[model samples]
Target: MTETDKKQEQENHAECEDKPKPCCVCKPEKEERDTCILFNGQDSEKCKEFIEKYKECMKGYGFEVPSAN
Candidate 1:
């Protein structure tokens, strides 16, 4: 089973272009960033760690943090 963002033309209003998703593990703007690593074929544990580390670093840089579940 698989799901993809087939609607490229249909932008996500909630996230907008430069906003982060509510479920985003890392702190990246929607327009300039995507969780390619998380979406990659890497282990979930590693991805989780990476996101946590990244979010923390971004917070240090004054970027907003995502409250991932």
Candidate 2:
């Protein structure tokens, strides 16, 4: 690739590395997530399910889940 193209790719990589991963769910998935369903708070059981699902999904996708589980 051209030098400019390579530089742009590096810049994109750096930006992604610095950005916190978005909350674990897609917009639609987030809608079904426990917190959205129960409307209590983030720590509610429903929200907990969402978090568990997210963590499991991440592990399944070869992303590291925090060892605290």
Candidate 3:
């Protein structure tokens, strides 16, 4: 005896669950930026390149990286 199964498998490709979180995705960029800022005694201007690179990396991953200064 065979039973009929009408179970459907839906594919939800637009969900955020499969994508990496911003914090977790750009660890190297974040760490480099943080280290630069810390080593310079919190002088962000000195770490401009690192900051910009980090922002670019985040933006590449579809994150809304806004410059607040």
Give the better candidate number (2 or 3) by lDDT.
Answer: 3
Q: What are the clashing pairs of model 1? A: none
lDDT leaderboard ranking: 3, 2, 1
What is the C-alpha lDDT profile of model 1 across 1-69, one tens digit per residue? 135655455546675377545653343433223464647615555456555566666676666565587
lDDT of 1 at 63: 65
Tens digits of lDDT, candidate 2, 10-57: 434334355555554344444567446568646666567776666676
RMSD values for the candidates in order, in angstroms, are: 13.7, 8.7, 11.4
TM-score rank order: 3, 2, 1
In angstroms, give how far residue 37 of model 2 lies from its true place: 8.4
Alpha-carbon lDDT of model 1: 0.52
> What TM-score fits each model?
0.32, 0.37, 0.50
- Most TM-score-accurate candidate: 3
Q: After superposing candidate 1, which stretches have Cα over 4 Å from the reference?
A: 1-43, 65-69
Pick by lDDT: which candidate is best? 3
Q: Which segments of candidate 3 are over 4 A away from where they belong?
A: 1-24, 66-69
Worst 10 residues of 3 by lDDT: 1-10
